[PDB]
Design a protein around this motif. Structure first.
Motif, PDB file in Angstrom:
ATOM      1  N   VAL A 104      51.519  28.005  34.812  1.00  0.00           N
ATOM      2  CA  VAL A 104      51.100  26.644  35.115  1.00  0.00           C
ATOM      3  C   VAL A 104      49.607  26.655  35.396  1.00  0.00           C
ATOM      4  O   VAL A 104      49.097  27.565  36.059  1.00  0.00           O
ATOM      5  CB  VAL A 104      51.889  26.058  36.301  1.00  0.00           C
ATOM      6  CG1 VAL A 104      53.359  26.009  35.968  1.00  0.00           C
ATOM      7  CG2 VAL A 104      51.662  26.877  37.557  1.00  0.00           C
ATOM      8  N   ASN A 105      48.907  25.668  34.867  1.00  0.00           N
ATOM      9  CA  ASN A 105      47.463  25.628  35.028  1.00  0.00           C
ATOM     10  C   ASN A 105      47.116  25.380  36.488  1.00  0.00           C
ATOM     11  O   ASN A 105      47.520  24.354  37.046  1.00  0.00           O
ATOM     12  CB  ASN A 105      46.855  24.541  34.159  1.00  0.00           C
ATOM     13  CG  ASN A 105      45.361  24.429  34.341  1.00  0.00           C
ATOM     14  OD1 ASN A 105      44.695  25.400  34.698  1.00  0.00           O
ATOM     15  ND2 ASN A 105      44.823  23.243  34.101  1.00  0.00           N
ATOM     16  N   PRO A 106      46.371  26.275  37.139  1.00  0.00           N
ATOM     17  CA  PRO A 106      46.023  26.059  38.546  1.00  0.00           C
ATOM     18  C   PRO A 106      44.895  25.072  38.759  1.00  0.00           C
ATOM     19  O   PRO A 106      44.625  24.714  39.912  1.00  0.00           O
ATOM     20  CB  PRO A 106      45.612  27.459  39.011  1.00  0.00           C
ATOM     21  CG  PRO A 106      45.054  28.083  37.786  1.00  0.00           C
ATOM     22  CD  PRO A 106      45.887  27.572  36.642  1.00  0.00           C
ATOM     23  N   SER A 107      44.232  24.620  37.697  1.00  0.00           N
ATOM     24  CA  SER A 107      43.079  23.745  37.866  1.00  0.00           C
ATOM     25  C   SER A 107      43.504  22.364  38.345  1.00  0.00           C
ATOM     26  O   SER A 107      43.111  21.917  39.429  1.00  0.00           O
ATOM     27  CB  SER A 107      42.307  23.638  36.554  1.00  0.00           C
ATOM     28  OG  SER A 107      43.013  22.837  35.626  1.00  0.00           O
ATOM     29  N   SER A 108      44.312  21.673  37.553  1.00  0.00           N
ATOM     30  CA  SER A 108      44.688  20.299  37.837  1.00  0.00           C
ATOM     31  C   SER A 108      46.057  20.243  38.497  1.00  0.00           C
ATOM     32  O   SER A 108      46.912  21.104  38.278  1.00  0.00           O
ATOM     33  CB  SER A 108      44.703  19.464  36.559  1.00  0.00           C
ATOM     34  OG  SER A 108      45.754  19.877  35.704  1.00  0.00           O
ATOM     35  N   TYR A 109      46.255  19.213  39.313  1.00  0.00           N
ATOM     36  CA  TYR A 109      47.531  18.958  39.964  1.00  0.00           C
ATOM     37  C   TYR A 109      47.947  17.530  39.651  1.00  0.00           C
ATOM     38  O   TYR A 109      47.194  16.592  39.925  1.00  0.00           O
ATOM     39  CB  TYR A 109      47.430  19.173  41.473  1.00  0.00           C
ATOM     40  CG  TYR A 109      46.992  20.563  41.851  1.00  0.00           C
ATOM     41  CD1 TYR A 109      47.775  21.662  41.542  1.00  0.00           C
ATOM     42  CD2 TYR A 109      45.799  20.773  42.525  1.00  0.00           C
ATOM     43  CE1 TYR A 109      47.380  22.931  41.887  1.00  0.00           C
ATOM     44  CE2 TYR A 109      45.400  22.040  42.877  1.00  0.00           C
ATOM     45  CZ  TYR A 109      46.193  23.116  42.554  1.00  0.00           C
ATOM     46  OH  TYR A 109      45.799  24.384  42.902  1.00  0.00           O
ATOM     47  N   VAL A 110      49.143  17.369  39.098  1.00  0.00           N
ATOM     48  CA  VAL A 110      49.614  16.092  38.578  1.00  0.00           C
ATOM     49  C   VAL A 110      50.680  15.539  39.508  1.00  0.00           C
ATOM     50  O   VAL A 110      51.611  16.255  39.894  1.00  0.00           O
ATOM     51  CB  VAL A 110      50.166  16.236  37.153  1.00  0.00           C
ATOM     52  CG1 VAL A 110      50.707  14.907  36.666  1.00  0.00           C
ATOM     53  CG2 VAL A 110      49.084  16.751  36.224  1.00  0.00           C
ATOM     54  N   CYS A 111      50.548  14.264  39.862  1.00  0.00           N
ATOM     55  CA  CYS A 111      51.571  13.578  40.640  1.00  0.00           C
ATOM     56  C   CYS A 111      52.805  13.389  39.770  1.00  0.00           C
ATOM     57  O   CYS A 111      52.780  12.624  38.805  1.00  0.00           O
ATOM     58  CB  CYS A 111      51.040  12.238  41.134  1.00  0.00           C
ATOM     59  SG  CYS A 111      52.129  11.381  42.267  1.00  0.00           S
ATOM     60  N   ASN A 112      53.896  14.072  40.112  1.00  0.00           N
ATOM     61  CA  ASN A 112      55.059  14.072  39.235  1.00  0.00           C
ATOM     62  C   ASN A 112      55.693  12.701  39.069  1.00  0.00           C
ATOM     63  O   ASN A 112      56.490  12.523  38.144  1.00  0.00           O
ATOM     64  CB  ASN A 112      56.109  15.057  39.744  1.00  0.00           C
ATOM     65  CG  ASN A 112      55.922  16.446  39.180  1.00  0.00           C
ATOM     66  OD1 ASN A 112      55.166  16.642  38.230  1.00  0.00           O
ATOM     67  ND2 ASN A 112      56.619  17.418  39.752  1.00  0.00           N
ATOM     68  N   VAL A 113      55.376  11.737  39.923  1.00  0.00           N
ATOM     69  CA  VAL A 113      55.979  10.413  39.840  1.00  0.00           C
ATOM     70  C   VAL A 113      55.069   9.423  39.126  1.00  0.00           C
ATOM     71  O   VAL A 113      55.509   8.706  38.228  1.00  0.00           O
ATOM     72  CB  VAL A 113      56.375   9.909  41.246  1.00  0.00           C
ATOM     73  CG1 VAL A 113      55.283  10.181  42.236  1.00  0.00           C
ATOM     74  CG2 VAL A 113      56.699   8.431  41.206  1.00  0.00           C
ATOM     75  N   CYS A 114      53.791   9.368  39.497  1.00  0.00           N
ATOM     76  CA  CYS A 114      52.869   8.424  38.880  1.00  0.00           C
ATOM     77  C   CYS A 114      51.877   9.099  37.943  1.00  0.00           C
ATOM     78  O   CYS A 114      50.957   8.437  37.454  1.00  0.00           O
ATOM     79  CB  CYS A 114      52.123   7.632  39.953  1.00  0.00           C
ATOM     80  SG  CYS A 114      50.895   8.569  40.863  1.00  0.00           S
ATOM     81  N   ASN A 115      52.041  10.393  37.686  1.00  0.00           N
ATOM     82  CA  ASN A 115      51.209  11.152  36.753  1.00  0.00           C
ATOM     83  C   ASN A 115      49.725  11.075  37.084  1.00  0.00           C
ATOM     84  O   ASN A 115      48.883  11.343  36.225  1.00  0.00           O
ATOM     85  CB  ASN A 115      51.452  10.714  35.310  1.00  0.00           C
ATOM     86  CG  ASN A 115      52.581  11.480  34.660  1.00  0.00           C
ATOM     87  OD1 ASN A 115      53.457  12.010  35.342  1.00  0.00           O
ATOM     88  ND2 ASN A 115      52.562  11.553  33.336  1.00  0.00           N
TER      89      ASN A 115
END
Lengths: 49, 50
Positions: free
Chosen positions: B36-47
């Motif tokens: 998994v890319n450690p750079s970005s973090y995505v909100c799993n509900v609202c992306n």
């Protein structure tokens, strides 16, 4: 695409991770490998067709 | 309450003598990038990414 450079002696290669590779033989533009040497030991042993 | 009686000098010398490096650098190491890319973090509900 990533391709290993052909070598002229039996070498020790590290295990590598590859993901992409085509579905047909799109290799016609290759002319020759290790032209200046006497033989290709490890890599793709292409010769003049 | 705790204490610590120090170990004998002799055994300490032996133990410290044998200590191979746990992280050696060599060119042939079978590198593998993170799944998994450690750079970005995505909100799993609202992306929404961060």
């Amino acid at each position: 695409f990533c391709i290993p450079i052909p070598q002229v002696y039996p070498c020790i290669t590290a295990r590598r991770v590859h993901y992409a590779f085509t579905s047909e033989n799109n290799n016609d533009s290759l002319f020759s490998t290790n032209a200046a040497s006497i033989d290709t030991a490890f890599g793709e042993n292409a010769a003049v067709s | 309450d705790i204490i610590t009686r120090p170990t004998s000098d002799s055994i300490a010398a032996v133990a410290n003598a044998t200590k191979p490096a746990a992280v050696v650098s060599d060119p042939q190491s079978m590198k593998v990038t993170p799944i998994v890319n450690p750079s970005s973090y995505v909100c799993n509900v609202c992306n929404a990414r961060f």
